[PDB]
Design an enzyme around this catalytic site. Sequence first.
Site, PDB file in Angstrom:
ATOM      1  N   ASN A   1      46.311  42.295  43.935  1.00  0.00           N
ATOM      2  CA  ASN A   1      47.164  43.325  44.534  1.00  0.00           C
ATOM      3  C   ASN A   1      48.655  43.004  44.467  1.00  0.00           C
ATOM      4  O   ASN A   1      49.413  43.352  45.370  1.00  0.00           O
ATOM      5  CB  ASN A   1      46.747  43.652  45.972  1.00  0.00           C
ATOM      6  CG  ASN A   1      45.251  43.910  46.091  1.00  0.00           C
ATOM      7  OD1 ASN A   1      44.669  44.538  45.216  1.00  0.00           O
ATOM      8  ND2 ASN A   1      44.633  43.474  47.196  1.00  0.00           N
TER       9      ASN A   1
ATOM     10  N   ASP B   1      32.252  36.692  49.828  1.00  0.00           N
ATOM     11  CA  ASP B   1      33.311  37.287  50.634  1.00  0.00           C
ATOM     12  C   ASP B   1      33.300  36.702  52.047  1.00  0.00           C
ATOM     13  O   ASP B   1      32.943  35.529  52.233  1.00  0.00           O
ATOM     14  CB  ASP B   1      33.143  38.816  50.616  1.00  0.00           C
ATOM     15  CG  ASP B   1      34.454  39.562  50.736  1.00  0.00           C
ATOM     16  OD1 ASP B   1      35.039  39.533  51.833  1.00  0.00           O
ATOM     17  OD2 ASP B   1      34.896  40.195  49.754  1.00  0.00           O
TER      18      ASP B   1
ATOM     19  N   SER C   1      40.097  44.832  45.820  1.00  0.00           N
ATOM     20  CA  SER C   1      38.860  44.442  46.490  1.00  0.00           C
ATOM     21  C   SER C   1      37.906  45.608  46.676  1.00  0.00           C
ATOM     22  O   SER C   1      36.701  45.385  46.824  1.00  0.00           O
ATOM     23  CB  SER C   1      39.156  43.879  47.877  1.00  0.00           C
ATOM     24  OG  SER C   1      39.640  42.559  47.828  1.00  0.00           O
TER      25      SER C   1
ATOM     26  N   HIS D   1      36.067  42.691  55.898  1.00  0.00           N
ATOM     27  CA  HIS D   1      36.322  42.857  54.470  1.00  0.00           C
ATOM     28  C   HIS D   1      35.032  42.796  53.653  1.00  0.00           C
ATOM     29  O   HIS D   1      34.768  43.673  52.818  1.00  0.00           O
ATOM     30  CB  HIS D   1      37.334  41.792  54.039  1.00  0.00           C
ATOM     31  CG  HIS D   1      37.764  41.876  52.609  1.00  0.00           C
ATOM     32  ND1 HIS D   1      37.096  41.227  51.593  1.00  0.00           N
ATOM     33  CD2 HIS D   1      38.838  42.468  52.034  1.00  0.00           C
ATOM     34  CE1 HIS D   1      37.720  41.446  50.449  1.00  0.00           C
ATOM     35  NE2 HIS D   1      38.780  42.194  50.689  1.00  0.00           N
TER      36      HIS D   1
END
Length: 279
Positions: free
Chosen positions: A161, A39, A224, A69
């Site tokens: 998404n 990430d 996520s 994130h």
Amino acid sequence: AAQTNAPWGLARISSTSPGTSTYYYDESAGQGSCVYVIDTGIEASHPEFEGRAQMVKTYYYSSRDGNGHGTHCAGTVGSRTYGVAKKTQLFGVKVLDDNGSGQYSTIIAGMDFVASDKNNRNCPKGVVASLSLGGGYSSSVNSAAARLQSSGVMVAVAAGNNNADARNYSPASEPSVCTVGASDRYDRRSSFSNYGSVLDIFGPGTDILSTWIGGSTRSISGTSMATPHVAGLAAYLMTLGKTTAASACRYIADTANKGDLSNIPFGTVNLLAYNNYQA
């Protein structure tokens, strides 16, 4: 063990019903497992990680999470308050820059890094990788995720998404990894969650409270956020000896809460991650 006033998603993964707020789990808590968070990095100094998080690789000028994130996702895997597997070891691999973006070639390098790097770590109960990232279909990205899984790592990836079929996204579309969709606190498919035949499981993904950079917390939404619930659950179940890296996705699907989600399109599994912990 019981954590009162837990984030709804933690409560959800140990419950046969929505609408509760206590997370129940075996005290082993993923001890002896490891989860790689591939990430934007992890703010390992966050008190919520209790020294159990470290950065092991970056492809940029810093290993710090300048975005948040990756820290949020790591928190859902294994932070003391916001995490599923509260005693796992967390390893950060920074393939995404501080704007949250990364070239596919860097992401692929990061996956091959994890497949080798696990041989430099102590993970007697097994190894998981959480990939809260993705883009358009790429056979090379899918193949990298397949290799990582083949190497003995439980790979969990975000479905995406786009409110669309995940067949057009990578690594979501790789058959051999665990592709995770998102649900909300009312057991509805999250409004943004991808779907399709390639999905293996849903996890909590709307309004998920976790760690953030600057030693903070915040609630955000996405596939996520669902992915690290499943990655943490896998680590927890592997520590318990109930499954292995090769079979953890299928075991999670076998033991999931079934048929309880709404607005799941025909042909997509109706399975919600569940730890089946009997307190």
